[PDB]
Amino acid sequence: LAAAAAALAAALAQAL
Protein backbone atom coordinates (compact mmCIF):
# COMPACT_ATOMS: atom_id res chain seq x y z
CA LEU A 1 0.00 0.00 0.00
CA ALA A 2 2.89 2.44 0.68
CA ALA A 3 4.46 1.47 -2.63
CA ALA A 4 1.20 2.37 -4.38
CA ALA A 5 0.77 5.61 -2.44
CA ALA A 6 4.26 6.71 -3.44
CA ALA A 7 3.70 5.85 -7.12
CA LEU A 8 0.68 8.10 -7.28
CA ALA A 9 2.41 10.85 -5.29
CA ALA A 10 5.11 10.89 -8.01
CA ALA A 11 2.51 11.07 -10.78
CA LEU A 12 1.09 14.27 -9.20
CA ALA A 13 4.50 15.84 -8.64
CA GLN A 14 5.46 15.14 -12.24
CA ALA A 15 2.15 16.54 -13.54
CA LEU A 16 3.54 20.05 -12.81
Side-chain angles (χ1 to χ4, degrees):
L1 279 49
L8 188 73
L12 283 194
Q14 181 57 16
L16 209 69

